[PDB]
Symmetry: C2
Subunit: 390 residues, 2 copies
C-alpha cells in the first residue's frame, strides 16, 4: 500500500485478566507503578509507535480484575509520560457521560500544549451502568440518548478548542497588544444537555487540537465514529469480521461527506512473539495455566485437547498473532493489504511481549517498506498522517 502501517501501545498495568498477575515475571504493583508506565512508553517510542493508549473505567466491584481495582487515572499518567517521551502520541479515555465539556476540553488541550501536540481523546459514550452511581446519577441514559449526549459534548469540546485562532497571540510588547481581539471567539452554546459560554482559556496547540478516537461497534456507534472520529478502535476476532467492519465504516464516512483516508482504523491485537513456534506456544501455555482449573465451571476443535486444555483456552484464548517474528509480521502485512487495518493497537500484558515486538517484528516491516525508519514529526496528527484542521 501507499501508506505505512502504524502502531499504538495499550499500557494496561497488570493486564486484562483475572490471574495473569500471578506469573513470576509480572509485577503485581504495575498498575500504579510509574516506572512500569515510563518504561513501556519509552519502549513503544523506540519502535516509533504513533501513540500510547490508556483505557479507563469508572466503576468496580470486588470481582473486578486486579488492574481495574487500583490504577492510574488517564490525564494524569499521560501528562507525566509527556515529560519523559518525545514524539509518541498520548491517547486517553474520557467519557462524555459525567464530566463537563469545559473541563475535558481544557485538560486535553493543556496536555496538548505540555506535549507539543501529541494529545488524543478516546471518547467513550457508554460507561458501565454502575458508573452513574459514582457520579450522582440514578442510572445511565439509554443507548440512543448516550450518543445524542456524546455528539453535543464533542461539539462543545471542539468549539471550545477553537475559541482562539492559531495566530491570535500577537505578544506585541511595544504596542501592548497581547492578543488580537478579532481572533477570539465565544461559543455561546445553549444546548439540550450543555450550556457553555466560553471562551476557553487556552489556545491552539502545535497540532491545532487533539485527535479524537472512538470504538463504537453498534450501528449507532459505527455511524457516530464515521461522522466524528479521526481514528477508530475495534477487535480482531477474525480477518473476515474486521475487513467487513473496516469497509462499512469507511463507507459511512464517505456518506458523511468525508475522505475515508482521514479515518484510521486500528484493530486490537495482543501478539506473542518468540524465536520459534515452540517458545511462543510455551509462553502462551504458561499464562493459560495460571487460572485455577476451578473454572472448568465456566465449538468443534479436534486438536487432541483435554478438558483441562479446553477450559484453559476458553479462559484465555490463543491469539492468531503468535509465533515467530516472521509469522507475526506476515499476518500483520496480510491484514493491512486486505484492508482490515490501517494499523493495530498492540496489547502487551505478557512480560517481554512489547519488547519482542519492537525488537523483532518492527525491523521486518521496515525491511519490507511497510513501516517508517523514523518518526515523521513531533505531533500525533503528523505521525498518523492527518491534517491540522483550524
Amino acid at each position: 500500500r501507499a501508506d505505512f502501517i502504524q502502531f499504538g501501545a495499550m499500557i494496561h498495568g497488570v493486564g486484562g485478566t483475572t490471574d495473569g498477575w500471578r506469573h513470576p515475571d509480572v509485577d503485581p504493583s504495575a498498575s500504579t507503578n510509574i516506572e512500569f508506565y515510563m518504561k513501556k512508553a519509552q519502549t513503544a517510542e523506540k519502535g516509533l509507535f504513533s501513540f500510547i493508549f490508556i483505557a479507563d473505567g469508572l466503576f468496580i466491584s470486588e470481582k473486578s480484575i486486579p488492574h481495574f481495582l487500583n490504577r492510574f487515572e488517564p490525564i494524569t499518567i499521560l501528562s507525566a509520560l509527556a515529560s519523559v517521551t518525545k514524539n509518541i502520541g498520548l491517547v486517553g479515555t474520557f467519557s462524555t457521560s459525567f464530566t463537563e465539556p469545559f473541563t475535558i476540553s481544557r485538560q486535553l488541550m493543556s496536555l496538548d500544549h505540555i506535549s507539543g501536540g501529541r494529545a488524543g481523546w478516546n471518547l467513550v459514550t457508554s460507561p458501565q451502568e454502575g458508573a452513574a452511581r459514582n457520579h450522582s446519577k440514578s442510572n445511565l441514559p439509554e443507548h440512543t440518548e448516550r450518543y445524542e449526549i456524546a455528539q453535543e459534548h464533542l461539539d462543545v469540546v471542539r468549539g471550545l478548542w477553537n475559541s482562539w485562532e492559531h495566530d491570535a497571540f500577537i505578544h506585541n510588547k511595544k504596542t501592548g497588544q497581547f492578543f488580537d481581539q478579532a481572533k477570539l471567539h465565544r461559543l455561546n452554546h445553549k444546548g439540550k444537555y450543555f450550556q457553555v459560554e466560553g471562551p476557553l482559556n487556552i489556545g491552539r496547540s502545535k497540532q491545532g487540537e487533539p485527535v479524537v478516537f472512538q470504538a463504537g461497534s453498534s450501528e449507532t456507534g459505527r455511524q457516530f465514529a464515521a461522522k466524528n472520529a479521526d481514528a477508530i478502535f475495534t477487535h480482531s476476532n477474525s480477518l473476515e469480521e474486521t475487513k467487513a467492519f473496516y469497509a462499512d465504516v469507511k463507507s459511512r464516512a464517505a456518506d458523511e461527506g468525508r475522505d475515508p483516508s482521514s479515518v484510521r482504523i486500528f484493530p486490537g491485537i495482543s501478539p506473542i512473539v518468540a524465536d520459534t513456534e515452540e517458545e511462543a506456544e510455551k509462553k502462551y501455555r504458561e499464562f493459560a495455566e495460571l487460572i485455577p482449573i476451578e473454572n472448568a465451571v465456566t465449538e468443534a476443535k479436534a486438536r487432541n485437547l483435554t478438558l483441562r486444555e479446553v477450559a484453559q483456552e476458553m479462559a484465555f484464548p490463543r491469539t492468531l498473532f503468535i509465533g515467530t517474528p516472521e509469522r507475526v509480521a506476515s499476518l500483520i502485512e496480510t491484514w493491512f493489504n486486505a484492508e482490515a487495518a490501517d494499523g493495530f493497537i498492540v496489547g502487551s500484558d505478557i512480560p517481554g511481549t512489547l519488547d519482542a515486538f519492537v525488537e523483532k517484528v518492527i525491523p521486518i516491516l521496515q525491511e519490507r517498506g511497510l513501516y517508517r525508519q523514523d518518526y515523521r514529526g513531533g505531533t500525533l496528527r503528523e505521525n498518523l498522517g492527518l491534517g491540522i484542521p483550524q
Copy 2:
C-alpha cells in the same frame, strides 16, 4: 521557634498583572511554556521549597490579564512536573462547584501515586460568577450554599480516598489473593448534592492521601478552613492583619477539636531581592513603569511622589519584602517569630526573583537555623511536618 519556616512557589506563567509581560526579560509565551514551568519548579526544589502551587480560573473575558487568557490547566501541569522533580509538593487548584468528587478524587490520588506522595489540593468554593455559565449552570449558588456544597464535596473526596486500607493489596501470587476483601470499603454516600457509591478505583498513596489547602477570608471561609484544611493561604497586606488572621484561625481550629499545629498558615508575598536597596528599587520601578500612564484615570504619603509615581504605585504596589537578602530574610524571620506565618507562598513574576530568593535569602535562613539544610522526606506531609491520617 521550634519549627522551621517553609516555602511554596506559585508558578504563574506571565504573571498577575496587565502589563508585566511587556518587560524585556519576560517571555510572553510563559503561561503555556513547559520549559518555563519545569525550570521554576526545579529552582524551587533547589531551595528545598515544600511545594509548588498552581492557581486556577474558569472564566475569562477580553479584559482578563494575559496569564488568565491562555494557560496550563493544574492537574496536567502538575503531573508533567512530577516526572521532572523529586521531593517538592505539587499543589493544584480545583473548585468544588462544578466537577464531581469522584473525578477530582481520582485525579488527585493518581497524581499522588505518580509523584510518590506529593499531591495537594487547593480547594476553591467560590469561583467567578461567569464560571457557572461555562459549566451548564445559570448562576452560582449563594455564599452559604457554596460552603455547604464544598463540605459535602470534600467529605466525599476524602471518603473515596479511604476506599482502600493502606495494606489492602496483599498481592499473593501463590494463593491468588490480590487484595483483602475486608479492607475495601464502599462509600454508599447519599447526600443533598452528591450521590456516590464507591469504591474508588485507586488505593492509598505513600502519604496516605493528598494534603488539602484552603484560602477562605470570610467568617464562613475561615471556619471551613479551620475545620478542614491542612494548610491555609492568605494575604500579607500588613503584619498586624496577618497576625490577627493567624491567631483567629488557629483558635477556630482548637474550637473544632484540632491541634493548631496541624494547620499551617502561609501568607502570600512577592519579594524583590537584589544586592543593594537601590538595585531592588530600580527593578520595582522598571516594572511599575510598564503600565501606560493612561490609568492615572484609575492615602497620605509624603515621599515626594509625583502624580505619575502615585498612579504607577497604585497600579503596582511596592512589596514590603523588597531590598537586600538580609532585609528580606529579616522581615520573614520577624513575621515568623511574630506568629503571622508558618511559611510563605512566594510569587516570582519579575524575572530572576525566585532565583535571587533561592540563591540569596535561603542560605541566610539556613545559617540562622530557621530553615532546613535538606528535604525532610519525599512526601508533602513529611515536608510540611504533617502526619499521615489513614
